[model samples]
Target: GSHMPQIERRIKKLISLGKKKGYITYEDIDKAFPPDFEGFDTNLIERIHEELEKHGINIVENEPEEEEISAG
Candidate 1:
């Protein structure tokens, strides 16, 4: 199972921080405070996994059949 609660909480934190920062991306979230939140280094990949560590969090990480292609 994915660590979705940590991810959601982190994302919410990230978004909130983003609003203050004027913009945000996966990298921004990863680079936020606390190194554990780093989602595979800018891939935004681990947020879901991080969040899922919490027990009983309704949010579930959906594993994509195909990996998302990141743009340069």
Candidate 2:
């Protein structure tokens, strides 16, 4: 797999959503995006994808996880 900015951003947004929904946790953030959530901004999936593409971050299609982020 190369890299998927869109998916990355989606994951980040999911973390933010988790925080907003009061489900924020270390595991939550980690699961949402990659282990590195500092330099990595997965907040806005589309926007992040554009930026990543502009900056030469290859976009992959599969960064799957067994536990998908959800609001509950």
> How many backbone clashes can be found in candidate 2?
4
Q: Per-residue lDDT of 1-72 in model 1, one digit per residue for the tens?
A: 555456555555665554444445444443444444444434344544444354322232233445668542
Per-residue CA lDDT of candidate 2, range 1-72, in tens?
446555555545544654654555444544554443334433445554564567544334334443456532
TM-score for each predicted model, relative to the true structure? 0.33, 0.30
Q: What TM-score quantifies how close candidate 1 is to the native fold?
A: 0.33
Best by lDDT: 2
Off by over 4 Å in 2: 26-72
Question: Which ten-residue region of model 2 has the weakest summed lDDT?
Answer: 57-66
Candidate with top TM-score is: 1
Judge candidate 1 at residue 44 and give its lDDT.
44
